[PDB]
């Protein structure tokens with residue numbers, strides 16, 4: 001059929017993970033998405049995590065590249081405290097509350113999309129926020145929300161092959177970005193520098209700058 | 222067989238049988254796949270071409286007549302007959318009028334064609350983005366050929382203006398000054414000489430335009446696009 | 453999954469989970485607001 | 494039925510139909526499943542909303558008029574003591590008993606309305622005034638001697654519109670009065686004092702800086 | 713559509729042509745309810761007529777203040793007019809105005825509730841009546857030819873005057889002096905004297 005996370009071994013989870021979802025390679029060895037309702041929830045979660053991690057990793061990469069040209073930008077792991085210091089008139093509680101309230105508005109919008117797939121493209125919002133559907137055969141809603149506002153440049157309207165290709169690009173880059181952010185957190189814990197700092201340290205001397213030499217991974221060396 | 226952006230290649234599909242001028246079958250990313258977006262992007266390209274033509278011509282002439290003024294910094298070092306606040310407000314109002322009219326005209330063709338003040342005056346029917354009439358007094362040659370000529374020149378002008386900006390960032394002098402600097406030593410002024418990266422070292426050119434500037438008290442964060450990302 | 457969540461809804465597991473949650477909550481309240489003898493408002 | 498709801502996408506419960514004024518399908522706690530309880534809650538909401546509109550008016554309007562420079566009345570929290578210390582002031586206990594004795598009569602009348610919405614109109618009740626208590630078929634909307642100007646007393650749907658305006662304003666007033674109470678308990682300043690304070694430094698002066706809202710123990 | 717080309721008249725303003733100065737301008741649909749629009753037309757007429765009166769008063773009295781013709785009465789700023797003594801104190805003037813306007817505005821309101829029922833005076837004098845907001849007060853009868861054109865002139869000048877009064881108060885709070893004083897101040901440069909450079913309006917600039 002398609003490519004599997006394990007060539008051969010067709011004992012991939014029973015056909016709730018057939019070659020239908022975008023990014024589907026039969027990887028569910030722990031069965032966390034077996035039932036269809038949980039599978040739909042997991043598809044939403046994976047796309048959202050991929051997009052959010054893509055945003056976060058791009059921000060971390062750029063902020064760590066600026067922090068190497070000497071620009072007055074802190075590293076990603078100290079940006080919160082650095083900002084709180086440099087802007088003393090702001091209250092942590094206020095910023096945390098505002099972030100939770102403004103994030104909450106849009107996340108309730110997305111929640112009531114998940115509950116009723118087409119219910120959010122009406123009332124105050126126009127009709128483009130109704131969603132184009134996608135996975136599980138739904139033709140409305142979903143993690144893919146077309147229209148002229150979330151897809152302003154029309155890069156998935158027209159040419160179904162092009163839409164599928166771009167969907168695959170998004171999903172694979174999202175999985176890569178999630179793995180990359182896990183790497184960022186692990187490298188920061190083990191070494192204590194930025195991501196670009198670690199990359200240039202490694203390329204400057206490829207040896208003696210592996211994970212063995214940081215003294216935290218291989219704990220005894 | 223026909224004119225191609227890459228001889229030997231085939232056109233996509235939307236770009237096959239264009240009615241837009243300058244169709245050389247580009248779009249390696251599929252932005253013109255849609256057909257409303259294709260017309261919107263065609264108008265955007267035309268206005269970008271014309272604004273960049275005006276910009277590059279103005280920069281060239283201003284450099285020719287006033288070589289002691291850096292075009293990049295000339296916004297703040299020029300001595301305006303008026304103020305800068307009211308000048309920008311006048312700019313804002315006039316451009317709002319004309320640009321809103323043009324944008325609407327593109328949105329719906331048979332619309333922004335009638336003079337408000339004088340009822341009798343009215344633009345004769347035109348294709349989008351080519352008003353003609355009062356806007357086109359003299360027409361030197363066949364219209365389609367001249368549209369192709371305009372599109373070619375506009376492409377070259379937009380590339381030239383981005384080059385102007387970049388040379389101003391890295392070299393710090395006006396375009397013809399940079400050309401004279403490259404012509405006295407062609408081997409040594411190229412970006413390959415000024416900047417280079419290898420595994421273990423990165424040599425990047427400094428930005429001649431300073432980090433900040435002073436203008437009537439306030440400071441405008443005018444740096445160098447994105448330093449550190451330069452090769 | 454469905455059967456695993458059904459198992460997590462069983463009285464032996466859900467009761468134990470709820471007792472653990474309530475115990476943890478009382479422990480947290482007493483950790484942050486200790487030695488409270490009266491309802492001082 | 495197809496009206497806007499408190500949460501777009503969440504359907505209204507099958508007991509909050511769409512007939513009551515101010516109906517947005519908001520009832521997460523399912524307090525109004527019983528029809529009789531729903532009528533009593535409607536009537537309670539009307540009373541709370543009307544008293545809160547009166548109270549919030551008598552709080553902000555004197556406060557804002559004092560601010561600009563007129564009437565110079567105290568701030569609402571201390572206004573009880575400001576009068577209480579006056580010379581010819583009625584004692585608190587006697588004053589409260591006078592108020593409660595009058596409101597006993599008035600509120601038991603309104604109560605006997607709420608039960609059978611034509612109760613108090615029986616002839617022989619008052620001294621010829623009993624006709625003004627006939628009601629208007631719905632509890633909480635007396636009319637008659639009440640509503641002297643006859644506003645909405647015309648097109649039915651006009652009365653329905655004014656009912657939504659009244660209920661929305663009352664809900665706003667009750668939310669605002671809860672705000673006044675919680676703000677004066679935390680920051681011992683007035684409502685306009687808090688307003689003019691927050692606009693000064695919105696990121697510094699808010700509810701996460703007074704130290705009473707967020708528990709000091711936690712932080 | 714008239715107020716903004718390529719837009720669309722909001723239906724309730726579309727076929728309703730018997731309104732003065734109808735241009736389809738209603739981005740907020742306050743007038744969707746027909747009774748609401750019937751009230752809002754009267755509100756617009758009252759606001760426009762009172763603002764034409766008020767702005768004419770402001771401009772004429774301040775022009776007299778600047779040039780100098782009306783004496784100690786008019787040699788004050790319009791907003792500082794409460795310092796003049798007059799034949800009465802402020803309080804009795806306010807009381808008299810309450811009484812008189814109660815009379816006049818209740819006559820107009822009774823006209824509104826049942827149009828045409830209140831035209832006759834206690835002495836039997838009977839005036840005519842045409843349209844709701846236009847009681848036919850025509851001593852010189854400028855209303856027999858092109859009446860819609862005259863209503864258009866009235867309403868357009870009324871909208872201009874309400875805009876003018878909003879400008880008067882906004883400028884008075886923003887910059888000091890009489891309105892025409894400010895007009896001369898703008899005409900002085902003008903590229904620096906404009907709403908941007910006050911320290912009161914953008915706020916983004918100079919705190």
Ligand code: CLA
Nearest residue numbers: 021023024025026027028032033042043045046049175178
């Ligand atoms: C939270 C992120 C996330 C989520 C919600 C999903 C969700 C999904 N993935 Mg997926 N994936 C992810 C990240 C994620 N993925 C990453 C980072 C990679 C790169 C390695 C992949 C690679 C991948 C492949 C190749 C495939 C999937 C597939 C699927 C779908 C079927 C499997 C399933 O439902 O299990 C649900 C998974 C979870 C509920 C996540 C649970 C994670 C556990 C509880 C924690 C342990 C993980 C981690 C190592 C622990 C680190 C924590 C600590 C060390 C800090 C499903 C909708 C299959 C598919 O067909 O897609 C349609 C499939 O082919 N994923």
Ligand SMILES: CC(/C=C/C=C(C)/C=C/[C@@]12O[C@]1(C)C[C@@H](O)CC2(C)C)=C\C=C\C=C(C)\C=C\C=C(C)\C=C\[C@@]12O[C@]1(C)C[C@@H](O)CC2(C)C
Nearest residue numbers: 027028029030031032052053056059076079178179181182
């Ligand atoms: C959300 C996310 C990252 C988001 C990052 C953000 C917002 C960063 C934000 C900021 O940085 C900025 C921008 C600026 C900084 O100054 C401040 C912070 C605040 C730091 C990554 C998730 C990262 C999530 C990761 C890495 C998840 C890995 C999951 C795996 C591997 C699961 C695999 C399997 O689940 C399957 C698929 C099938 C199962 O059956 C079996 C197993 C094996 C369980």
Ligand SMILES: CC1=C(/C=C/C(C)=C/C=C/C(C)=C/C=C/C=C(C)/C=C/C=C(C)/C=C/C2=C(C)C[C@H](O)CC2(C)C)C(C)(C)C[C@H](O)C1
Nearest residue numbers: 091092093094096097100701702703704707708709711712
């Ligand atoms: C369930 C779930 C989530 C959350 C869902 C929730 C819980 C939504 C609702 C959230 C609410 C109501 C959050 C309220 C937060 C209030 C906060 C965070 C107050 C913070 C202030 C603090 C901690 C103290 C600040 C001080 C500072 C440092 C200075 C002094 O002056 C003193 C002091 C006041 C102590 C997230 C993670 C968001 C996503 C979703 O996917 C899963």
Ligand SMILES: CC1=C[C@H](O)CC(C)(C)[C@H]1/C=C/C(C)=C/C=C/C(C)=C/C=C/C=C(C)/C=C/C=C(C)/C=C/C1=C(C)C[C@H](O)CC1(C)C
Nearest residue numbers: 520521522523541544545548551552569572667668670671
């Ligand atoms: C709906 C629902 C349903 C679902 O299901 C569930 C839930 C969620 C629960 C819900 C909600 C609820 C809520 C929100 C509530 C709130 C309320 C309020 C706030 C009230 C007040 C209310 C309020 C009120 C009455 C008030 C009143 C007031 C007053 C009189 C005042 C008085 C005064 C004055 C003038 C002044 C002086 O000097 C003082 C005094 C003496 C003080």
